[PDB]
Design an enzyme around this catalytic site. Structure first.
Site, PDB file in Angstrom:
ATOM      1  N   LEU A 143      -1.519  -3.796  -2.010  1.00 50.14           N
ATOM      2  CA  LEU A 143      -1.800  -3.046  -0.859  1.00 50.14           C
ATOM      3  C   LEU A 143      -3.479  -3.121  -0.515  1.00 50.14           C
ATOM      4  CD1 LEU A 143       0.741  -0.315  -0.962  1.00 50.14           C
ATOM      5  CD2 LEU A 143       0.808  -2.398   0.324  1.00 50.14           C
ATOM      6  N   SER A 174      -7.430  -4.099  -2.580  1.00 50.15           N
ATOM      7  CA  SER A 174      -8.288  -4.197  -3.856  1.00 50.15           C
ATOM      8  C   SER A 174      -9.790  -3.988  -3.802  1.00 50.15           C
ATOM      9  CB  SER A 174      -8.149  -5.448  -4.770  1.00 50.15           C
ATOM     10  OG  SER A 174      -8.534  -5.587  -5.895  1.00 50.15           O
ATOM     11  N   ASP A 184     -16.886  13.481  -0.858  1.00 53.67           N
ATOM     12  CA  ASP A 184     -16.584  12.131  -0.466  1.00 53.67           C
ATOM     13  C   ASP A 184     -15.579  12.211   0.804  1.00 53.67           C
ATOM     14  OD1 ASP A 184     -16.979   9.398  -0.078  1.00 53.67           O
ATOM     15  OD2 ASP A 184     -15.876   8.883  -1.909  1.00 53.67           O
ATOM     16  N   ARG A 201     -12.216   6.763   5.799  1.00 50.99           N
ATOM     17  CA  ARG A 201     -11.571   5.938   4.921  1.00 50.99           C
ATOM     18  C   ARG A 201     -10.830   6.493   4.089  1.00 50.99           C
ATOM     19  NH1 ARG A 201     -16.982   6.111   3.805  1.00 50.99           N
ATOM     20  NH2 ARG A 201     -17.496   7.216   1.878  1.00 50.99           N
ATOM     21  N   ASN A 202     -11.165   7.670   3.486  1.00 43.58           N
ATOM     22  CA  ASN A 202     -10.351   8.588   2.487  1.00 43.58           C
ATOM     23  C   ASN A 202      -9.384   9.495   3.020  1.00 43.58           C
ATOM     24  OD1 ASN A 202     -11.922   7.500   0.486  1.00 43.58           O
ATOM     25  ND2 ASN A 202     -13.597   8.949   0.776  1.00 43.58           N
ATOM     26  N   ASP A 216      -8.510  10.465  -2.397  1.00 37.63           N
ATOM     27  CA  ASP A 216      -9.638  10.000  -2.913  1.00 37.63           C
ATOM     28  C   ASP A 216     -10.444  10.823  -3.576  1.00 37.63           C
ATOM     29  OD1 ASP A 216     -11.624   7.458  -3.430  1.00 37.63           O
ATOM     30  OD2 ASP A 216     -10.568   6.662  -1.737  1.00 37.63           O
TER      31      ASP A 216
HETATM   32  C1  LIG Z   1       0.195  -0.262   3.712  1.00 31.73           C
HETATM   33  N1  LIG Z   1       0.051   0.828   2.839  1.00 31.73           N
HETATM   34  C2  LIG Z   1      -1.066   1.334   2.186  1.00 31.73           C
HETATM   35  N2  LIG Z   1      -1.935   0.374   2.305  1.00 31.73           N
HETATM   36  N3  LIG Z   1      -2.929   0.918   1.677  1.00 31.73           N
HETATM   37  C3  LIG Z   1      -3.210   2.001   0.855  1.00 31.73           C
HETATM   38  C4  LIG Z   1      -4.663   2.044   0.003  1.00 31.73           C
HETATM   39  C5  LIG Z   1      -5.072   0.693  -0.251  1.00 31.73           C
HETATM   40  C6  LIG Z   1      -5.508   2.963   1.343  1.00 31.73           C
HETATM   41  C7  LIG Z   1      -2.203   2.819   0.372  1.00 31.73           C
HETATM   42  C8  LIG Z   1      -2.144   4.126  -0.143  1.00 31.73           C
HETATM   43  C9  LIG Z   1      -0.860   4.618  -0.256  1.00 31.73           C
HETATM   44  N4  LIG Z   1      -0.785   5.772  -0.970  1.00 31.73           N
HETATM   45  C10 LIG Z   1      -1.669   6.558  -1.564  1.00 31.73           C
HETATM   46  C11 LIG Z   1      -1.314   8.009  -1.850  1.00 31.73           C
HETATM   47  C12 LIG Z   1      -2.516   8.768  -2.388  1.00 31.73           C
HETATM   48  N5  LIG Z   1      -3.732   8.116  -2.764  1.00 31.73           N
HETATM   49  C13 LIG Z   1      -3.761   6.835  -2.415  1.00 31.73           C
HETATM   50  N6  LIG Z   1      -4.982   6.262  -2.789  1.00 31.73           N
HETATM   51  C14 LIG Z   1      -6.351   7.222  -3.073  1.00 31.73           C
HETATM   52  C15 LIG Z   1      -7.313   6.648  -3.951  1.00 31.73           C
HETATM   53  C16 LIG Z   1      -7.618   5.179  -3.326  1.00 31.73           C
HETATM   54  O1  LIG Z   1      -8.081   4.375  -4.372  1.00 31.73           O
HETATM   55  C17 LIG Z   1      -6.774   4.195  -2.742  1.00 31.73           C
HETATM   56  F1  LIG Z   1      -5.765   4.196  -3.910  1.00 31.73           F
HETATM   57  C18 LIG Z   1      -5.896   5.202  -1.720  1.00 31.73           C
HETATM   58  N7  LIG Z   1      -3.088   6.210  -2.026  1.00 31.73           N
HETATM   59  N8  LIG Z   1       0.089   4.292   0.330  1.00 31.73           N
HETATM   60  C19 LIG Z   1       0.245   3.132   1.020  1.00 31.73           C
HETATM   61  C20 LIG Z   1      -0.930   2.323   1.138  1.00 31.73           C
END
Ligand SMILES: CNc1nnc(C(C)C)c2cc(Nc3ccnc(N4CC[C@@H](O)[C@@H](F)C4)n3)ncc12
Length: 309
Positions: free
Chosen positions: A16, A18, A135, A139-140, A153
């Site tokens: 999803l 990197s 932060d 984006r967070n 985040d």
């Molecule tokens: C299309 N679906 C998705 N696409 N991207 C992300 C991230 C990459 C933003 C997703 C992230 C998530 N779930 C969670 C839940 C809680 N925290 C996050 N993180 C927090 C820390 C960041 O390093 C990133 F991992 C986002 N993601 N679910 C779906 C995502």
């Protein structure tokens, strides 16, 4: 409150995102052979042997595991084998910043203002738990559905001791363009410097994802702030929304609003959204409902599960 699980209970399905710190996967929790398969997000540490990178993701995990609110993301679990993997709620959408850039044409004033309220509510919760996020940025913030967003985040977040006002930070790399002047000059963070970041985050949303101070280099930022320059009024904002933004960026941190005041003020505006944001074509804009978001999810899971076969 870390639930430490076995790495073998999780299959990674799809990437999803990197970055340099690591990778986010869509995964399935499979604790019983082939009878249970539950969708999750898994963040995996790249630099498994780096003590500094381990420190960072474990601090993130700790803050994330101690939160519990509907406008805040929490840690479902952790795996601690040769690397660290955080187990998190799977969203159908990514971050709000990417969301507002991609869906600009169908985002109306009621959505923009609900998002402001929800982020303030999430920050008010964090302040009440003594957490300085450090932060906050578009984006967070993650999109669960277009009507429901959550703060995530927590890598930079710090838990203040009782009645302590300030966190004095060490040196390192920091997001200058979201930081309060006192944070740039003196490395001091508070709930009120978090309020400064919140105002920048609102400005990202009202511009549908413009980069703040676009053109001006990071090392020039404290100079322009001291001279009195701030982020410009977004085209859709009436003066009353922009004044709220500008109050968040005043020099005296105690003259900045509080999160609880921001919830009340944005709630009021959300009651009559078109008076406060002037968007062309507002009344005929369509965004997917919560039930659409579940459809989209079931659709994506159908094809991804066909891909694994
Ligand atoms: C299309 N679906 C998705 N696409 N991207 C992300 C991230 C990459 C933003 C997703 C992230 C998530 N779930 C969670 C839940 C809680 N925290 C996050 N993180 C927090 C820390 C960041 O390093 C990133 F991992 C986002 N993601 N679910 C779906 C995502």
């Amino acid at each position: 409150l870390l639930r430490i699980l076995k790495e073998t209970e999780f299959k990674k399905i799809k990437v999803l995102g990197s970055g340099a710190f690591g990778t986010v996967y869509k995964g399935l929790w499979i604790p019983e052979g082939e009878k249970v398969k539950i969708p999750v997000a898994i963040k995996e540490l790249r630099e498994a042997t780096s003590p500094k990178a381990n420190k960072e993701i474990l601090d993130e995990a700790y803050v994330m595991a101690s939160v519990d609110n509907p406008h805040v993301c929490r840690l479902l679990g952790i795996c601690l084998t040769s690397t660290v993997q955080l187990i998190m709620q799977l969203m159908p959408f990514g971050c709000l910043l990417d969301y507002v850039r991609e869906h600009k044409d169908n985002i109306g004033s009621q959505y923009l203002l609900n998002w402001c309220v929800q982020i303030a509510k999430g920050m008010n919760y964090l302040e009440d738990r003594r957490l300085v996020h450090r932060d906050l940025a578009a984006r967070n913030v993650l999109v669960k559905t277009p009507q429901h967003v959550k703060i995530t985040d927590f890598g930079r977040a710090k838990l203040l001791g009782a009645e302590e006002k300030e966190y004095h930070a060490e040196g390192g790399k920091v997001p200058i363009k979201w930081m309060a002047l006192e944070s740039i000059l003196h490395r001091i963070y508070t709930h009120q410097s978090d309020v400064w970041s919140y105002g920048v985050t609102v400005w990202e949303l009202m511009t549908f994802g413009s980069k703040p101070y676009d053109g001006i280099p990071a090392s020039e930022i404290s100079s322009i702030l001291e001279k009195g320059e701030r982020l410009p009024q977004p085209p859709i904002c009436t003066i009353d929304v922009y004044m709220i933004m500008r109050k968040c960026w005043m020099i005296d941190a105690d003259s900045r609003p509080k999160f609880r005041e921001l919830i009340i003020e944005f709630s009021k505006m959300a009651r009559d959204p078109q008076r406060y944001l002037v968007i062309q074509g507002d009344e005929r804009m369509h965004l997917p409902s919560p039930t659409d978001s579940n459809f989209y999810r079931a659709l994506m899971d159908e094809e991804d599960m066909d891909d694994v076969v």
